[PDB]
Amino acid sequence: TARLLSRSDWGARLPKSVEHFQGPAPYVIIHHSYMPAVCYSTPDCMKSMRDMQDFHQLERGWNDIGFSFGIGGDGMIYTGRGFNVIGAHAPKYNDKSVGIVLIGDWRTELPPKQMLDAAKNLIAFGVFKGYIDPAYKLLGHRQVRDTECPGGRLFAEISSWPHFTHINDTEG
Ligand code: NA
Ligand SMILES: [Zn+2]
C-alpha cells in the first residue's frame, strides 16, 4: 500500500534555505517524534508533519522540519528535507545521513507493522536509487547524542534490522 508523498501532498511550508551534501549517504538515523503521537489516518499524519514543521521552523528557528522523511501509522512515507539535503536531526551526521522519524511515542510500544515496513521500504528505495550507500550503517539517535530517541522499544526493534551497528565496535 505504501507510497512516498511529496511535501506539497502534506501542505508543507517552503524551506527558508536548502543546503545539500554530495554522494550516497553512509548513515541512516532512526527517530521517533514523541509528540505528535501515533497517527492512523492520512489526514492526521499530514497534520502531524505540519505540526513538526511548525515546531521546527516557527518555535526552534530552523530552516525546515529537521528530518529527511517521516513515516505515518497510515503506512505512508512523507518527504521532509529529502535525500542529499543537510538535516537538523542528528549532530555530526546531518550532512551524511538520512534521518527518518517514525511519528509517535515508541518508548514502550512497537510501531505497527505498516510503519516498520514503510521505513525498510524507504531505505531499500534509497539504496536502489543511489541516495543511500549500499554499505550504510543504521543507528538510532540515542547512539550519537544524549537522548532517549527513538524510544527503547523501537531501538530494540531497529537493533534487529540489517546494517544496525554500534559506534564503539571500532576503537580509536
Ligand atoms: Na535548520
Ligand atoms: Zn531523534
Author numbering: 12 to 183
Paper text:
Drosophila PGRP-LB belongs to the amidase PGRPs and downregulates the immune deficiency (IMD) pathway by cleaving meso-2,6-diaminopimelic (meso-DAP or DAP)-type PGN. The structure of the PGRP domain comprises three α-helices and one central β-sheet composed of six β-strands, similar to the bacteriophage T7 lysozyme, a zinc-dependent amidase. The main difference between amidase and non-catalytic PGRPs is the presence of Zn2+ in only amidase PGRPs, which is coordinated by two histidines and one cysteine. We generated mutants to characterize the amidase reaction mechanism and solved the X-ray structures of wild-type Drosophila PGRP-LBPA/PC and its mutants in apo form or complexed to TCT.
To tackle these two scenarios, we designed and analyzed four different mutations of the conserved residues in the catalytic Drosophila PRGP-LBPA/PC: H42A, Y78F, H152A and C160S. Only the Y78F mutation caused complete loss of the enzymatic activity for every compounds. The introduced mutations did not affect the ability to recognize PGN, attesting that Y78 is the only residue taking part in the amidase mechanism. Initial X-ray and enzymatic analyses showed that the Y78F mutation does not destabilize the protein structure and prevents PGN substrate from being degraded. Y78F and C160S PGRP-LBPA/PC mutant structures were elucidated to 1.30 Å and 1.40 Å resolution, respectively. Both mutants Y78F and C160S PGRP-LBPA/PC share a similar fold with PGRP-LBPA/PC wild type with a RMSD on Cα of 0.49 Å and 1.12 Å, respectively, but in different space groups, P6122 for PGRP-LBPA/PC_Y78F and P1 for PGRP-LBPA/PC_C160S. PGRP-LBPA/PC_Y78F also presents a crystal packing artefact where E182 from the C-terminal of a symmetry-related molecule makes a coordination with Zn2+. By comparing the apo and complexed PGRP-LBPA/PC_Y78F structures, the C-terminal symmetry-related molecule is filling the binding pocket of the peptide moiety from the PGN attesting the non-physiological nature of this interaction. We showed that Zn2+ is totally absent in PGRP-LBPA/PC_C160S mutant as already observed in the structure resolution, while it is still present in PGRP-LBPA/PC_Y78A mutant and PGRP-LBPA/PC wild type. Regarding PGRP-LBPA/PC_Y78F, the amidase activity is also abolished without Zn2+ in the buffer.
